Amino acid sequence: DQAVSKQQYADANAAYLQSKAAVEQARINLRYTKVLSPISGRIGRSAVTEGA
Amino acid sequence: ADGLAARGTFTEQLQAQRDLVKASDEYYQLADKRYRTGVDNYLTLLDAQRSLF
């Protein structure tokens, strides 16, 4: 009903997508903990043990 | 002649005044929609209501 402009709607949508991208980067930076196996196959030993 | 001048001008004045009231009523309705969705507070709604009054 044009209670706001169309322009600051586009500005709020831009800030929403930027904060979405920042949450996505924090989520992949937390997914870089608990280091996933990149490939499937056979695994050796652990050169770096617990606590190191 | 003054009565005829009043008849001639108050239709234009009163139609401009009804358009003033329609504009202020639509402004109050948009401020009420802006409040009910939640963007502005209740003080701006009361200010729009006093303008309509």
Return the residue of A nearest to B36 by Cα: A3
A5 lies within 8 A of chain B by CB: no
A4 lies within 8 A of chain B by CB: yes
Residues 6+ apart with CB under 8 A from A43: A37
Q: DSSP letters of B1-53?
A: -HHHHHHHHHHHHHHHHHHHHHHHHHHHHHHHHHHHHTSS-HHHHHHHHHHH-
Q: For residues B10 and B50, what is the distance between their CA atoms, to the nearest angstrom?
A: 25
Q: For residues A40 and A29, what is the distance between their CA atoms, to the nearest angstrom?
A: 22
Deposited resolution, Å: 3.6
Technique that determined the structure: cryo-EM
Q: Which chain B residues touch A if contact means CB-CB below 8 Å? A: 30, 33-34, 37, 39
Residue of B19, B28, B18 lying closest to B53 (CA atoms): B28
Residues 6+ apart with CB under 8 A from B21: B52
